[PDB]
Amino acid sequence: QQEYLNNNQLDCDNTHNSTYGNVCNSVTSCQSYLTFKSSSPEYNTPSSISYLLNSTPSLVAKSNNITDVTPIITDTMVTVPVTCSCSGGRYQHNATYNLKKTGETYFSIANNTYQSLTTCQALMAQNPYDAKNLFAGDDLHVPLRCACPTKKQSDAGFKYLLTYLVSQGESPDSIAEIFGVDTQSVLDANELDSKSVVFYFTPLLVPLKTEPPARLQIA
């Protein structure tokens, strides 16, 4: 189980424990998965998606049953296999990002470009620049949110945890349907309960008993 972000990442003055990333409460490394909505014209191929998220064009390719140069239709959610490793007491997958234009912010990079796969808190915590002091050409360490299954999750038969990008209209029940798991199991992984509220544009952990489906459909 990991703590749920609970929209604490939309206010870059918030300092909650969860905004700095998932907590290293299990094995030191593991295979994990991210999700990412294809965006044209900059991030709609395996090369550019894996360049942004620091994966590999063929892992993206095999994970979605496409070729490593297949253009992905805009707004399609694709799975991105990434190595998750403990770092300073946090689970993360290290990636790098050059600011393309002066005017981008830690929040715009976190919520817009990376689609809430990281937080401005984690970006600020792991980069030297002050928030109001960013210029085109600055090179940022990007800690992407991932986690490794706990011994309790591994005992229940979960091999991977997946970071899911929640869209408007979904529920822990409809998301768990995509991956064929108990709606409960999704609530455990994010330390939620039956009455808990799940916001869109906020990443959610999904425990997987097998590899994710090649094509995620209705979200």
Ligand X SMILES: CC(=O)N[C@@H]1[C@@H](O)[C@H](O[C@@H]2O[C@H](CO)[C@@H](O[C@@H]3O[C@H](CO)[C@@H](O[C@@H]4O[C@H](CO)[C@@H](O[C@@H]5O[C@H](CO)[C@@H](O[C@@H]6O[C@H](CO)[C@@H](O[C@@H]7O[C@H](CO)[C@@H](O[C@@H]8O[C@H](CO)[C@@H](O)[C@H](O)[C@H]8NC(C)=O)[C@H](O)[C@H]7NC(C)=O)[C@H](O)[C@H]6NC(C)=O)[C@H](O)[C@H]5NC(C)=O)[C@H](O)[C@H]4NC(C)=O)[C@H](O)[C@H]3NC(C)=O)[C@H](O)[C@H]2NC(C)=O)[C@@H](CO)O[C@H]1O
Ligand Y SMILES: *[C@@H]1O[C@H](CO)[C@@H](O[C@@H]2O[C@H](CO)[C@@H](O)[C@H](O)[C@H]2NC(C)=O)[C@H](O)[C@H]1NC(C)=O
Ligand Z SMILES: *[C@@H]1O[C@H](CO[C@@H]2O[C@@H](C)[C@@H](O)[C@@H](O)[C@@H]2O)[C@@H](O[C@@H]2O[C@H](CO)[C@@H](O)[C@H](O)[C@H]2NC(C)=O)[C@H](O)[C@H]1NC(C)=O
Ligand U SMILES: *[C@@H]1O[C@H](CO)[C@@H](O[C@@H]2O[C@H](CO)[C@@H](O[C@@H]3O[C@H](CO)[C@@H](O)[C@H](O)[C@@H]3O)[C@H](O)[C@H]2NC(C)=O)[C@H](O)[C@H]1NC(C)=O
Q: Which positions from 176 to 215 touch ligand X by CB under 6 A, shown as an x/- string?
A: ---------------------xxxxx--------------
Which CB atom, from 46 or from 143, has the smaller least distance to ligand Y? 143
- Count of residues of this chain found to bind ligand X when the rule CB under 6 A is applied: 23
Residues between 106 and 125 that touch ligand U (CB under 6 A): 111-112, 115
Residue 85 found at the interface with ligand Y (CB under 6 A): yes
Give the footprint of ligand Z on residues 155-194 (CB under 6 A). 191
Token pair belonging to 140: 């940022």
Burial tier of 133 (Cβ tally within 10 Å: 0-12, 13-18, 19+): exposed
112 binds, among ligand U, ligand X, ligand Y, none (CB under 5 to 8 A by kind): ligand U
Q: Indicate which single residue of 107, 114, 158, 179 sits in contact with ligand X (rule: CB under 6 A).
A: 107
Q: Site residues for ligand X, window 46-75 (CB under 6 A)?
A: none
Note whether 8 binds ligand Z by CB under 6 A.
no
Q: From the CB of 85, what's the least distance to ligand X, in Å?
A: 26
